[PDB]
A = this chain, B = another copy of it.
Amino acid sequence: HSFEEVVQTLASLATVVQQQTIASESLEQRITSLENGLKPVYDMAKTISSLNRVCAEMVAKYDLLVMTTGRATATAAATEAYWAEHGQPPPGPSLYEES
């Protein structure tokens, strides 16, 4: 009966040592995940504020803007639309303004 008890104790010790190894691997994986997960948080926190600042500045600057018309928008848009489908340039003669 002694041999059976010795074998059972050895098997239990081996299984619990494997449990130690599994626990150590889990500890290492959790530590690595914690260390590497939250590295760029400071950089993103700094970047978001600057992006918001520049975006607000430009959306405020957009109000103070004056646009002057020109004699080429209609012809350019017509050329673009004629090129979009059946992509051949519009037939002759030439349109109002070509550039």
Number of A positions contacting B (CB below 8 A)? 82
- A35/B35 in contact, CB under 8 A: no
Q: How many copies does the complex hold?
A: 4
- Decide if B37 touches A40 in the complex (CB within 8 Å): no
Given the contacts A51-B52, A72-B73, A67 and B93 also touching, CB distance less than 8 Å = yes
Interface residues of A in 1-55 (CB under 8 A from B): 1-3, 5-6, 8-10, 12-35, 37-38, 40-45, 47-52, 54-55
Binding site for B on A (CB under 8 A): 1-3, 5-6, 8-10, 12-35, 37-38, 40-45, 47-52, 54-59, 61-77, 79-80, 89-99
Going nearest first, the 9 A-B pairs with the smallest beta carbon separation are: A72-B91, A70-B76, A70-B73, A40-B45, A44-B45, A34-B34, A67-B76, A72-B92, A51-B52
